[model samples]
Target: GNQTDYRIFELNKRLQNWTEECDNLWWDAFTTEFFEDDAMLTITFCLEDGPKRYTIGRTLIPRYFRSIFEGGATELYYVLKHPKEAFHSNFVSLDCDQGSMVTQHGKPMFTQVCVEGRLYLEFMFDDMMRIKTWHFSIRQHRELIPRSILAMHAQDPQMLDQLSKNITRCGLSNSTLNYLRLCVILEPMQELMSRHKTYSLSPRDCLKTCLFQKWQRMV
Candidate 1:
């Protein structure tokens, strides 16, 4: 269950700067590099003002829109079509909720398309924009966690005991605890893979290969 009315306290006791009114920003183009079946693309765009509120939409360009899409594409590298110069490609915009999209003001938002964990992609959009100056970032979805509870669990057995007692008193079962533990680890990864589905590989296979390589390295 999520907490509804928790008091907020500043961590590290630092005050943050607040600003009003920001610059206008938009996406211009992007480029991609490929290695085997894996690839990376860098996008470049222009900002009219300095730092302002903005939103980013990544979509796959349709086959008919290939020229407009590709022309504006600063870089591209795909394997099957041409291996070198894959033209006549279809482009799809990376968006959230099918027909709906997420709006961001000061922070970055991550969106995904599938749950398999393979064939995925991610990008970051920032609010700060300037003419002749472009900001690039990497986007990732927020992981859910009970920060205080986890920290207490790690540092103090007494705190953990009290927390367990309170949870049990609240009618949470042992099975529920186990479920929560599993979900804490699985949910973020699932969200991550789902967003990458719009791109080339399957997230499931990617996770497998990654684990295999990790195990091999350990051995």
Candidate 2:
């Protein structure tokens, strides 16, 4: 098939518009007026298909549902579902280790750690929807980069040298450095969910079995 440059640009521009509009709608729907405590933020990203489709009912759905009905919400949900098989398959992959922290219950947990402050985020994908939930966690002991770090790098030569020294002391390798750079550029959203409480959603369970059962009954 011949590529259409103008159509591609137009489609992308519309997609950006849809993204911003959906984000605003989600913000209004999730945030309440009176409460000041922790709340689960649910943001739905609409994928570009023949028509508009959504990814729903991931980790964040239960958290949000609990918040309104059960008095607490922990863990934000990003529900995304692709309408087409090709699109869905592009996002799903297999894992070798299913029982380690690195591989939450046999599913591969993709992770990226920031180099500047050493912040890390873990991602898990839903097989049926081809949607991935990115969970961001900040270590309790690791130091964070202050707002001044960026300014210091530009204004004080000594600060840059000190930063480099700290990075080296952390035993950071070249691969780690590359990961950090990717994090800086990517700048994924930070979602705050409840911690220390137990929930029913187990990452070890296989989604394929459940999805197959649903499909067998559907016309």
Candidate 3:
């Protein structure tokens, strides 16, 4: 009776304190570089199984998440810049590792770290936040990257010498850009993630633009 009661207690607590519960399970804390430099990982949790669980870093269904990141700035510009209807939603935090997250059971949260800060690769999974095909890439104590995008980058580049740098300025991994080149939005969404490229607006001088226009209205 005590064990069953405890389980329910824990489960109910998880339901009510979702972020506090999962914040302890962030995979970045266990990455190899965690201690070396400490600020070595950044990730976006794609999905969450109540508390202390997650998929990758995307979506806005009261979307809760994180990502293991590193040295340079890797922005989720498109995901972060979308309109309110599809914004960060109810429970989202700016990227950060409050240092060493762990579950109540005291087990390592992440299975692996498959990629690093270079290419962008989002895990493809069914819409209900489940994996059917089970194509997973685990970066060991390492920053993970999606295998689906890497599989695309290995192909070709026939661009001329003077192509605009705008193509490369997407702030995404080279792998992700390649996949979007085909512009194929797969239909069977139940078992995969949605991946696509974004439009590039040339760098706007922030101070100049802000002063000229009311940034308040935009934000």
Candidate 4:
């Protein structure tokens, strides 16, 4: 392949691997190797309670990473793991796929892992093709969080508990990874499921509303 095509391919590969490790060492290495010196990183969370920007890529940025990932490997993993490019001109957008299992049967299903919404991300590159600006935003679908939490817990019951512990260890008590917070979200999600269950409401309308409204606010 040509250089441009090869570069794009490599970047995508690394980005896919990005969520595999949720430790500080991997994050530090990624920041140093993939980002420009003055690169900017902006992170948005479902809770929206952490640092929003880091102006210097190799320095202040990793501090933010430490604060978040120090809590639990599980939170970091499920949050950023599956980014489905949904690339070009130094920019790319990704949809963070929430889970792995396909439908239970041939019939359509709501709680099916694949049907959950995705986390959002956008990246911009510099002249040399190094990462210059990165935006990491949590999937805004309200039910997405609850569904993802359940799926993740189902996969690793201890992981979520560890996630909760880590967040506490790191002193980020307000993080959405908390068990209590997830419990709070579960009932609301159950309500949404019931409303849609009666066929009185459409899935698209329910799934897409908050994200669309959030996106419009930035415009």
Candidate 5:
């Protein structure tokens, strides 16, 4: 699929009266508001140091925690309750697994949350603290191509050969997580095949062609 910029700079609407909460209560509220119901939910913890981050689906919580931490908990139980008392003197600082001194040194970065392709919400601070801007870019509800597909190919005799065959069979062989992974891309299939091709098709032009020529597709 041809996509737009990750940051919708031109289209992002300005926001006011955003939430007044720290990571502790903020994220608890995040799940309550953003967690998808009946969708293939995904949660991510952003790393403020660089352009590096992490992703986790609902099923991968506790079982997935241990590996990513050294001498860390195997069966983890995270707390999400409100604090006991008000802070009169102490300014509270929180943390995620962004285990780097440099990352911890991150500024109050703005958080931009978008939806089915429109900017929905954004969070800014004193920016108070942009510990790890968790953008729970809600996953779309649909049938998931199972993990067994990857495992079968990974364990096969001719792993590369089988991987290619298996993905093609699943229609997910560079299909950008299953788009044209189902839409069947044409020549640019191999670099040698389309090194001579020109960029003549616009988005509208391509859509028109795909609809008219349903027998052979281009994605």
Candidate 6:
């Protein structure tokens, strides 16, 4: 109801529309136009016990998202269902359904996962219309990396080596890269993947629950 009054709401709404229309180019455009050098990006992989990840500054933030692009994320866009704010608050929250597909690395057709997940994004902004802080939680019901890829890594040492090189070169946090490296190997990775083979809720339902939890926390 209050969207028409705030400049931040207008900008955020427009950004969402632009992303829906042209998400691939939106990242580059955002960094160049709306991003600030001092901003921070925090990501929590909701529904997992893993620790949160934080990325700081303009260069690193774009580079981090770029790494995901290089990892084969395709067709990512947020459907901004609800936007919330208070008159005195510097933060705006977007309750979004993030749709994405990640194909197997190094090849398009080997395997892929289409993810429809909950994304709770809160963007903190400065008066100059630049992003100051970006935080979000992704509650994905399915894994981004396909099981086939992990299986391939289990058998092919060279394939794993090449993957290690690319992942390291991309500059993801050391801890994340370490777990990724470990998860592509033998028995443990397979067991881990199998542990979540069956989900009782549909993707949308899973997302709805997680999104609600995240939204409540934001209050």
Decreasing lDDT order of the candidates? 6, 4, 2, 5, 1, 3
lDDT of 3 by residue, 116-215 (tens): 2211211112222111111122121223233553444435344322121221122223343333332223212322221111222222443334445566
Residue-level lDDT tens digits of model 5 in 135-180: 3322221122335455545656675353333222111112222322
lDDT of 6 at 126: 48
Question: CA shift at 42, candidate 1, in angstroms?
Answer: 37
Stretches of candidate 2 exceeding 4 Å from the true structure: 1-93, 96-128, 131-157, 165-219
State model 2's lDDT: 0.26
| Model 1, span 14-122: residue lDDT tens | 1121112111111112111111112232222122333222222222111111321221222121111111111123321122221111111221111111111111122
**Residue 77 lDDT, candidate 5, scale 0-100:** 19
Query: Could you tell me the lDDT of residue 130 within candidate 5?
Result: 17
Per-residue C-alpha lDDT of model 6 across residues 83-176, encoded as one tens digit per residue: 4443336665544455232323335434334344444444454454555566554455333445666675777787665544332222233444
> Model 4's lDDT to the true fold?
0.43
> Quick one: best TM-score, which candidate?
6
Candidate 1 stretches greater than 4 Å from native: 1-179, 187-199, 216-219
TM-score of 1: 0.18
Evaluate model 4: give its TM-score: 0.34
**Clashes per candidate (backbone, < 3 Å):** 32, 9, 33, 1, 2, 0
Q: Which digits, one per residue and each the tens of the lDDT, describe model 4 over residues 40-118?
A: 6544333446523212234555545444433332232233344566276666555555622111111111221222233
What is candidate 3's local distance difference test score? 0.25
**Which candidate do you rate higher for TM-score, 1 or 2?**
1
Error of 6 at 42 (Å): 0.9
Best by lDDT: 6
Which residue pairs in candidate 4 have backbone atoms (N, alpha carbon, C) closer than 3 angstroms, thus clashing? Answer: 71-166
Cα error of candidate 4 at position 187, Å: 39
Cα error, residue 28 of model 3, in Å, equals 13
Note the residue pairs that clash in candidate 5.
125-128, 175-181
Tell me the whole-model lDDT of each prediction, alpha carbons only: 0.25, 0.26, 0.25, 0.43, 0.26, 0.46
Native-to-model Cα distance after best TM-score fit, residue 167 in candidate 5, in Å: 38
